[PDB]
Structures are given as C-alpha cells and as structure tokens.
Design a protein around this ligand. Sequence first.
Ligand code: 5RF
Length: 447
Amino acid sequence: TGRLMLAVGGAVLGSLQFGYNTGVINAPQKVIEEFYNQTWVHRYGESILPTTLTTLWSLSVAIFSVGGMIGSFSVGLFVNRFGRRNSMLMMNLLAFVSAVLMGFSKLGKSFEMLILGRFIIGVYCGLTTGFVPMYVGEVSPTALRGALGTLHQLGIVVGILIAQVFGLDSIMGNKDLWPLLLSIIFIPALLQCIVLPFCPESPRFLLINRNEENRAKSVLKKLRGTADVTHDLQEMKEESRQMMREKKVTILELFRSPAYRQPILIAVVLQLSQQLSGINAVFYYSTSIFEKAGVQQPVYATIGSGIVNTAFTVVSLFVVERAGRRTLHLIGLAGMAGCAILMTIALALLEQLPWMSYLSIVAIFGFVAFFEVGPGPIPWFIVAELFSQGPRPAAIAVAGFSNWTSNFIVGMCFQYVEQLCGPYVFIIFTVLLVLFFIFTYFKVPET
Ligand SMILES: COc1ccc(CC(=O)N[C@@H](Cc2ccccc2Br)C(=O)N[C@@H](C)c2ccccc2)cc1
C-alpha cells in the first residue's frame, strides 16, 4: 500500500489533466476572442463578424469533444497491445504537441493551431478516461479497489477548478498569459513522464495479455506490499475465467440482436441526459453566462461553481451506496430542472431587480450541485450493471460515443441557441431535463 500510492498518484495526473483541459476555456473566453478578431484584421483588413466569431470560438471548445470520441474508441487498441503503463507514458506525446500548438498559437497568429491543439488534447483526454480507470483497478487490492477508483472523478472536478482558478485576471486569464494558461499542461505531463517509468506495469497485463505467471507476482509483492500473493494471483486467474467464459460481443452485435436493444436504449439515453442537461453549458460558459447576468467578478462565480462541484462530488460518494440509483437520478434531474427555471427567473427579473444576479449564482450553484449527485455518476453505475463481462466492453464504447456526441452538441450549439432564446436558454435544458425525468420514471429499472 506504500508503493501503491505512487502507481495511482502518477496515473491520476492524467485525470487531473482531463479536468483541466475541460474547463480552461471558461474564464479566458473574452481575451481569446479578442485575439481571433485581432488576427482576422491583420490578415484581411477587416473586423471579424460576430456570428462568425461565435461559431469559430464554439468550434475551438467543441472540437475537443470530437477528439475525446476518437480517443475513447482507441483505448482498447493501445491498452491490450502496448500495456497500461506504457500507454499513458507515450500518450504524453499528444499533451506536449498540444501544449506547443496552443502555447505558440498567439505568436503564430493562428487560431488553426489552437483549434488543432484543442483537438489533439481531446484525443489524449478520450484515451485517458479509459487508461486511468482501468489501470487503478488492475493495481489496487480488492478491498481498497472501490475507494481508489474514485480518484479519477476527483481528478476531473479538481482539474476543472484549478483551470478556473488560474483563469483569473490576477494570474493567467488575461491578454498576456492565456497562451501559457493553455500550455501549462506540460508540467503535469513532464511530471507523469518522470513518475510512470518507475511505476509498475499492470499485473493483469502480465498474467493474461502476456502470459507471465511468475513476472506478475514480482509486481504484487512490491505493489501489494505483502510478501506472498498466492490468493490474489488466483483471484486474477478466476476472473480471467469469468471475463473470457462468454464471448465478448461487439458493437455491431449489440444493435442487431433484440436481446440488447432495450438495455442499450437506457444506456444511450442516460448518456444524453448527462450532457443535454447542460452542465457543460456551465463548465464551458460559466463566466459568459454570469456576465450576461449582472454578476460582478464573474470568474469568481465560475470558481464557485467549480468549488460547489468539487464539494458535492465528495458528498455523492457517501450517498451512492447509501441510497438507490433510480432515486438519486430522478432527484438530480428534478434539482437541475428547478435551477434551470430559477436561472430563467433570475435572468428575466434581473433587468428590473438589480440583485437577481445573485440568484443566478444560487441557481447555477444548485444546477451543478444536483448534477454531481444525479446525472453525473449514475449513468456509469447502470451501464456497467446492465451487461455481463461479454457485452459490457461494447456498451462502454457506445456510451462513450453517446457521451462525446451529446457533449459536442451542447458545447458547439449552446452559443448558437443563446443568441436566439435569450434568457430562455435554460428552458431547453428544463424541457430536456423533464423528458429525461419521464424516461427514467417508467422505462429505466433499478439495481
Ligand atoms: C465506467 O468507467 C468510467 C467511470 C467514470 C468515468 C468518468 C467520466 O469521464 N465521466 C463523464 C463526464 C463527467 C462525469 C462526472 C462529472 C462530470 C463529468 Br464532465 C465522461 O465524459 N465520460 C467520457 C469521457 C467517457 C465515457 C465512456 C467511455 C469513455 C469516456 C468514465 C468511465
């Protein structure tokens, strides 16, 4: 358990980087848009059109989701061929390439570099959410396996928060240091590049994927700390039997047979309910929505949503196992549906009452606080509980595609919907939050 901390802590760095890159583009939105118009003038002697500047910057945040899709498609490619440890170590290449492309984007007067960098890091982030959850599971003892598996989620939320903190005007969220705000990912990457070579390879990769019965226990004896591991070594050979007993079905065989078309419908929808609820409307445009209200120091209100999100993440841990899963998901959608309304109330009466800007903060704070106990974790505590070791890997891949797709719809189209709906944007979220509430109250079972 001593050497165990190093093997995990070096893997979580990717999940911290996952959370970072997700929420870096929140506070420094205004300053990077000023760079886009400044580049547009220098090239063509012309101020950029606002509708074009919108779809252009929306593409700069949304393309990251497209990368995540490809990445989560390719997790199995590198995992089973190159290993778990060696995969996370080489994929730091993308992080550096992306840091260079985004850091030197301003110096080259190229928004293409920034977009291209935002994409490459998206690939890294789509792969990371397959490497890290898998590596920590194939490392920790069965007892500590449930607890240490949480550090991935915490890495996402804390990473978002650090990005929003560094997004202040005092620090890096300004006209001078926004290229460094995007590029600072090289530090965690360089740290993980130093740590991982000293971390142990996944025993399950040595035992199964490479048939090294004796080299495996050479790891667990230093990893588990215990001298012998005769029982754990056989625990792996017991689930290797249970994982490979039934044929692992493919994505194609999942849609075809009508034995899986009802569980998958639940899986996909619950993924759409995580994204089309509209939390990445906050975690991407928090500082923009708050400014559209009457918020003073709007970047701090985003850090508030970041802190609130971190808080209720920890609370959720002691509630998921302490209560049901149908209930915590219905409560979540209902809470978000109320805050989405409370937002519209706080956004409509603000023009008359110069203090509803405070209510908008209370609203979004509850909007993300309820998400973290409902449509955040539950969609993963059901898909895995709807498929055995055979068709489960195929369900993750579809849910991954379903998650990145829906996440791309929000991140890309939210600013196109905001110019038309005005204060009635969160109505769409409120509508969808109801459809997802109806669907779960009837067509979704309990586990
Ligand atoms: C079952 O294995 C897991 C467990 C947890 C996770 C965590 C995660 O990435 N969850 C959401 C996003 C999210 C969760 C909780 C709070 C805020 C947010 Br934003 C996600 O985007 N997953 C994507 C990256 C994914 C889905 C399926 C397969 C690969 C990647 C991923 C796979």
